[PDB]
Amino acid sequence: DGPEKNYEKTMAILQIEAEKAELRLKELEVRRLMRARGDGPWYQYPTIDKALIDHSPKTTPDN
Amino acid sequence: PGIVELPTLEDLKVQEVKVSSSVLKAAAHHYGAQCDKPNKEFMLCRWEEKDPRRCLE
What are the CA-CA distances from residue A60 to residues A40, A55, B43 (Å)? 41, 13, 11
Q: Where are the alpha helices (DSSP H) in A1-63?
A: 3-37
Rounded alpha-carbon distances, angstroms, from residue B23 to A50, B14, B15, B29, B36: 46, 20, 17, 11, 18
Residue of B44, B47, B51, B56 to mutate, interface with A, max A Cβ within 10 Å: B47
Partners of residue A57 in chain B, C-beta under 8 Å:
47
* Residue among B7, B19, B17, B11 at smallest CA distance from B38: B17
Q: What is the DSSP letter of A51?
A: G
Cα dihedral value A27, A31, A32, A35, nearest 10: 170
Whole-angstrom distance, CA of residue B53 vs CA of residue A60:
16
The residues, any chain, with a CB within 8 Å of residue B55's CB and separated by 6 or more, are: B42, B45, B46, B49
Give, in order, the Cα–Cα distances in Å from A5 to each of A2, B26, B53: 6, 107, 88
Resolution (A): 3.5
User: Could you tell me if B50 lies within 8 Å of chain A, comparing CB atoms?
Assistant: yes
Q: What angle do CA A15, A18, A20 make, to 5 degrees?
A: 110
* A-chain residue closest to B53, CA distance: A62
